[PDB]
Symmetry: C3
Subunit: 159 residues, 3 copies
């Protein structure tokens, strides 16, 4: 069951749903806009033959940050990990789903391939999986609206 703007505001204004930093202009009919943080992980594929989910591979990615005033350029076929600017804190009876923005959706931008489901009790910056399936580069600006977060009510609180 999808929380409406009024219900999202009720949950926030009562501290059961944590959103830091909070911006009320971001609340939509039945969701809230999220923004792009400025740290990214790229994959170092010249040292590894392959990914093995059963193993640990601590050189698999590196942390990056665009120079001030520069964009992060996402080329078609490149896969990179980013984060929501906001820090989220969910209670025991709400789950989250990321959805794309219609705006950026028509531009070929994917934000959560891969994984956009957020467990109740979650707390942290939401991981974004960024992809471009268009046939040009897209310039990403730290701070921009990147997608939207829906809250789903559970039939009852989690054990």
């Amino acid at each position: 069951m999808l929380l409406s703007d009024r219900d999202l505001r009720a949950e926030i204004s009562s501290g059961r749903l944590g959103i830091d930093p909070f911006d009320d202009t971001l609340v939509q009919p039945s969701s809230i806009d999220v923004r792009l943080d400025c740290l990214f992980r790229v994959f170092n594929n010249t040292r590894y033959t392959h990914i093995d989910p059963a193993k640990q591979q601590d050189e698999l990615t590196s942390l990056v940050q665009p120079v001030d005033g520069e964009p992060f350029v996402l080329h078609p076929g490149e896969f990179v990990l980013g984060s929501t600017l906001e820090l989220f804190t969910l209670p025991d009876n709400l789950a989250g789903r990321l959805e794309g923005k219609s705006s950026l959706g028509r531009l070929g931008l994917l934000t959560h391939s891969t994984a956009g489901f957020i467990d109740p009790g979650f707390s942290g910056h939401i991981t974004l999986e960024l992809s471009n399936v268009a046939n040009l580069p897209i310039t990403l600006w730290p701070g921009m609206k990147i997608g939207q977060l829906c809250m789903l009510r559970l039939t009852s609180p989690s054990e």
Copy 2:
């Protein structure tokens, strides 16, 4: 909370949910099948170096229609915009989610990458984001079943 066929029928036959043209055989257990319109947008990437979400890029895409009776050929790696043949009209207490059809899913077709979340209050033809992640071209026939739309009930009407 997901509307059943019975409840979808109720909403439709009461005019609260607009679907034109409607076809009863399209109703599924907890969703409604949608069909492919015949107009497509392709990207004109020979005149632009890149997409910039923050600008107006005016001839980025172009209208494309195949010959009546010809398939739109969609090759792996191409990204194209299309629409549902049906015109949708949502009330203020329901939201929509596009989902793939199991049939076309197994053939490598993606229809809403990108963006498949439809706000309550929406009215129009639903935009499709078309992609082919298989290893062969897929022939698209306008009028064919392309996917399905679910209705989610909101916790309360939106502002």
Copy 3:
């Protein structure tokens, strides 16, 4: 409306939701983890020019099964069909959604592109659409946790399951 762990347990322990084989440690706060079965279909694209959804195309896929103890290696840009090791049986008041696991999501793994919505009344092994959008190959181990399944309550039981 999303079933919690406690409601998923009630549905299962009363037989209205079938999961075979069932393992209680896989239950998550509002979903259940699913596992990778060992048969895969790959596409034989040297015999056809194209896929046509309106025709029947029988020699379209081929059966690949990894030797035991070894993995199915999934290269970027390849598309393969797999299956949940579990058998699911849904009653007609519940629908299912596949979602990715956070851990595999950060490795570039797609499990249900394409199609992750399960109708009420469904019964069978759930089809997985496998893709790798990373820039390395990923080794898949049959039996591994591959994703999760959420249950949605319907506003009322379905008429035409």
